[PDB]
């Protein structure tokens, strides 16, 4: 049978979460994303980007620290409306925000369907130079999803190049290196992809996205989750083949399924966390969901970076004849430099840079970008499952150092309806424990002109302040990680909750947030919560 | 000489009546912000009907507003219930046709190299764009969302000797990147067609026949 | 966007549904029930009970006539030796059909030794001698089979070998030759699970699900297959003693969206019923056992079911390749699947004589390209927020005093009954009532509970629905008029055609087929006027 959805140990409704601090304004914001650098919290929004000092103050209302202003020129707001887009869509929506170095800031905005980037100082939030072009680095439409990541001084981005958003591409520039892009109008590389996240690991950059499956074309248009690697030291192909194109781009399907007689695959990838160490294994967690025109369901799978790096060393898959089953290419026919290994690595020392790759290998990787095997998840089964709810899990944040002794693993999940799910992943079959479920949306302070958009735009965990910042389209909420205050004087509940961030203190006499290095003696039962002899 | 009796239908909307004693046949012109007059299309059409606009005495309604670093000019065709608006910006030009009823966007084209687009039988657009030092001007008229009728290409600064003598039909267009400058919104693909009477004039005048080869016309 | 599950207008918990009569006649292990000539028959282990439907007022119900047929010691010993469980080795009746108006036809497993015997209707005695029942009755009571008499001919679908590997569709008796599917192989049947057969016009239709041959990457798709009633087999060289009209087509029960989501596991299919002028059968579909639990009810017009088999066939242009439609120019002149003696077929006297090329074509191209489209191309009913899967389905095309209401009843694997008002001009369905009927008190045995519903039989004469469980048979009256009792508000809110408010007595009560008293019921909407 199918695993049943576990019951939340505790439930927190909007009635209780109506007291958490909310950013709001101090008009709409159209918040796009949130990231944390040191103690500063950056809120990327329409025509603006705010900063919040996390280490300062706890007032009921969050007040902005510094406010950067970047409005599109009138000469550009008009040239966007003339094209056909709505007035509401012809503004400067910040869709790229990365740290360039120790003091610079790299910010790109849609700028009324005309992407343009600009460098900013971190200490004074002021422009640092002229606006260079934003093509292939920032999307045109604020509704689209885009990825950007700085690695070894270079900028890796993935978005659409054209006004109509038809030519999606992965791009690289600004790294004192030549620019590279995927083959234009080549469905074998990317077929209407939807980029989600990119991570830096070892000598490769991994892009996680979903796209129309090329091998599963018998049924029709089906969306499959993919992971794609690109070497960090790639410098393009030769003058004749794959010039200004990737020479190490390979992709493989993500396997997030419940193994049985007939496996059930979750295909719609929603979010992917960065590389996080967990039980001595570099691992990334990813949330997958069922298609929009199917029964609602969501699953969280974890993937070991070693398994990811190992799936790109396997055999490739091809179509021997058009409209036929895909078969794994035998190794005896692959030329022997391995397609996808970075120049100057083991057994490839004879090739200085990618420019010296033989023509035949460039052609092979141009016509065979898809790997045969699928990336196996940890334990070959999803870590978490929800199938009896109407909402769809999207964002995911993980705390690999949660608890008093910093040896737990707590994963936070967002949803398209504003509900936060929290479960204690264990690291050797993992029993798992769905700790709590909570509605964080605050209609009193987030609704604008009687409109309710609950889609979570981002989640950022702040271990220093024991808080989790959840950003909505019109507001940002500071949700405490522990929520110990709700339990209060009910020791029976404080122990039965089995919450790592909480505990019981006889000195104070109440349930309260537990500091990582709190000399006060705490009582908790994370292993097994026995309420016998206490309550109610 | 010319008395421009004006008035205001709505906020920031003005009508310019062009009356000449010698002609003794007053005209009507539009003047306002293009963006505002491209959304209230239903409202403006009603007012025009209500002010006793001559049904067939005027064939085309001229519009030409002047704004900083911009040149919004166009003509609404009352007979076809359509409209053409042209916007010349500091770095790119926009040519858009919106059907007057229901404000339906039939097809919107745009180019980054066309500048100072003027409006002229049937009125047709003209524009000049120089890829290099030599200046090349081409006349065109877009009939359908996927088809462009580019009849004539005026060359200047000894362009004929510079390039035409070298090659001496579609290959020549591709070489000069006519397709690249033309960016078609609402459709990825684009097709080019030529009028039967199309001629290229730079003094040398040439006009290709049905076959790909291009013969000359006058010399 | 996906359609949300409608809310049940009325819910009856297990606590309330204990008064309803319960029949328990030891472990019964019922196989199926069926109503015939106003009399309910109970097919179960080594015993056939006949509850008297006429005594509806009687709260208690006792088997008037008990049929006894126990396996012989030799057969029981053989079953035990072969390795089957001692409990499984018993005479499980799995086929009960009416041979004629004065005869009864019964087949039982007979402890893994299929055998059939004719029984008299009135006296209920062994009217005739028995005989081997191989390929007519399954070996394991857990397995499902179909049997359907038509024009004195017995069409069956089950497994022939003890290992349950050789699934076959069969036809015996009636002074006609024996016909069967190609033994073993996968061209015609690849591990099927038979559900129901119906008789319509001149074509017998079998509904089942089987391993999809089109999906190389193992998925189970629902199929409908037709056979010619007058089929006489192939020539002496090709298809000798085999079917010459076996064709099958995919069932399309999906929610139109960006990507179609198909309900693949067919659960039950009702007999042919005349609804809204059109002849239609209703079928229940569920998601696979290793998928998110969800169920759907789709309806199929017999006209569309016939039309699909007149389209293009399926074929593999090359081995290990996608399936493509057979070109229309390459079909033999006598269209495979058409029965001899019909239109444009005077030349062929009987199915026995055909051209060998047609026979080879229909033996190598049994699957039709197009799929059977459902009425309105969308499921009539959907449940996606529960753990159980809808199984059995009963339909009443003569509901209400005016007999123009169509009420559909749906069973579940957990003993919960679903009732919705199917409206046929397309409109949203109306969930009328959901209720759990399993009476744990009277049905549980040795603290063991099996809520899996084994069958549902609607009886219009007593306005009741008999729901059979493995350990008991529960007589559920249609709806729950007695529940509401005297109050009229809730009765007008439930909008159940089977309940009405009496004008003379001033109390809500169940309706009757013909009654002089006036009726009060607002079907379109209930405003709860005069709320108490
Ligand atoms: C996704 O991962 C599952 C993990 O179970 C794979 O299921 C295995 O498939 C292989 C061959 O298909 C079998 O030999 C194993 O027995 C299966 N596992 C179990 C537990 O039964 C599944 O094939 C993978 N899907 C892919 C690679 O597309
Ligand atoms: C995290 O580490 C602490 C100690 O640093 C663990 O607490 C001890 O766990 C062991 C079991 O391995 C018990 O025998 C001790 O009594 C515990 N000491 C206490 C509670 O003071 C804790 O279990 C670890 N958490 C994990 C592994 O999840
Ligand atoms: C099952 O039925 C659905 C709906 O009847 C089919 O969806 C249609 O697909 C065609 C092209 O494949 C479209 O032109 C129609 O517009 C679709 N219908 C709707 C309502 O959108 C589906 O193709 C069918 N599948 C099979 C295998 O027969
Ligand atoms: C939350 O407040 C609303 C206010 O209308 C109330 O209806 C609801 O019952 C409350 N939920 C609780 C107290 O759990
Ligand atoms: C944090 O701040 C210090 C000083 O303000 C700075 O040196 C350091 O680089 C900052 N952290 C990061 C990751 O840049
Ligand atoms: C139905 O039963 C009644 C009485 O039990 C009997 O008289 C009648 O003949 C039966 N119907 C048929 C078709 O045999
Ligand atoms: C059945 O017929 C009666 C006769 O008047 C009518 O009132 C009723 O609406 C009909 N039922 C339906 C479902 O239309």
Swiss-Prot record, chain A:
Which residues lie toward the Extracellular compartment? 1-536
Q: Where in the cell is it found?
A: Cell membrane
GO MF terms on file? chemorepellent activity; semaphorin receptor binding
What GO biological process term is on the record, naming one?
A: apoptotic process
Keyword Transferase on entry = no
Record's keyword annotation contains Signal: yes
- Sema domain: which residues? 6-481
Q: Which domain of life is it from?
A: Eukaryota
Carbohydrate-modified residues are 15, 38, 255, 407, 430
What coarse category fits the chief subcellular location reported for this protein? membrane
Name any GO cellular component annotation. Answer: membrane
Q: Which family does it belong to?
A: Belongs to the semaphorin family.
Quaternary state and interactors = Active as a homodimer or oligomer. The SEMA6A homodimer interacts with a PLXNA2 homodimer, giving rise to a heterotetramer. Interacts with EVL.
Q: What is this protein called?
A: Semaphorin-6A
Task: Record the organism.
Answer: Homo sapiens
Q: Which gene encodes it?
A: SEMA6A
Q: Please tell me where this chain falls within the complete protein, as first and last residue plus total length.
A: 19 to 567 of 1030
Swiss-Prot record, chain C:
GO cellular component annotations, sorted alphabetically?
A: axon; membrane; plasma membrane
What ranges does the Extracellular topological domain annotation cover? 1-532
Subcellular location, principal: membrane
Q: Which GO terms describe its biological process?
A: animal organ morphogenesis; apoptotic process; axon guidance; cell surface receptor signaling pathway; cellular response to vascular endothelial growth factor stimulus; cytoskeleton organization; negative regulation of angiogenesis; negative regulation of cell adhesion involved in sprouting angiogenesis
- Which Cys-Cys disulphide bridges does the record give? 79-89, 107-116, 228-339, 253-298, 443-472, 481-499, 491-508
Cite the entry's keywords alphabetically. Answer: Cell membrane, Developmental protein, Differentiation, Disulfide bond, Glycoprotein, Membrane, Neurogenesis, Phosphoprotein, Signal, Transmembrane, Transmembrane helix
Its topology with respect to the membrane? Single-pass type I membrane protein
Any one Gene Ontology molecular-function term assigned to this protein's record: chemorepellent activity
Subcellular localization: Cell membrane
Superkingdom per UniProt: Eukaryota
Sema domain sequence ranges:
6-478
User: Which positions are glycosylated?
Assistant: 15, 37, 252, 404, 427
Q: What does this protein do?
A: Cell surface receptor for PLXNA2 that plays an important role in cell-cell signaling. Required for normal granule cell migration in the developing cerebellum. Promotes reorganization of the actin cytoskeleton and plays an important role in axon guidance in the developing central nervous system. Can act as repulsive axon guidance cue. Has repulsive action towards migrating granular neurons. May play a role in channeling sympathetic axons into the sympathetic chains and controlling the temporal sequence of sympathetic target innervation. (Microbial infection) Acts as a receptor for P.sordellii toxin TcsL in the in the vascular endothelium.
The UniProt similarity line reads:
Belongs to the semaphorin family.
| Complex and partners | Active as a homodimer or oligomer. The SEMA6A homodimer interacts with a PLXNA2 homodimer, giving rise to a heterotetramer. Interacts with EVL.
Its name, as the record gives it, is Semaphorin-6A
- Mind giving the lineage of the organism this protein is from? Eukaryota, Metazoa, Chordata, Craniata, Vertebrata
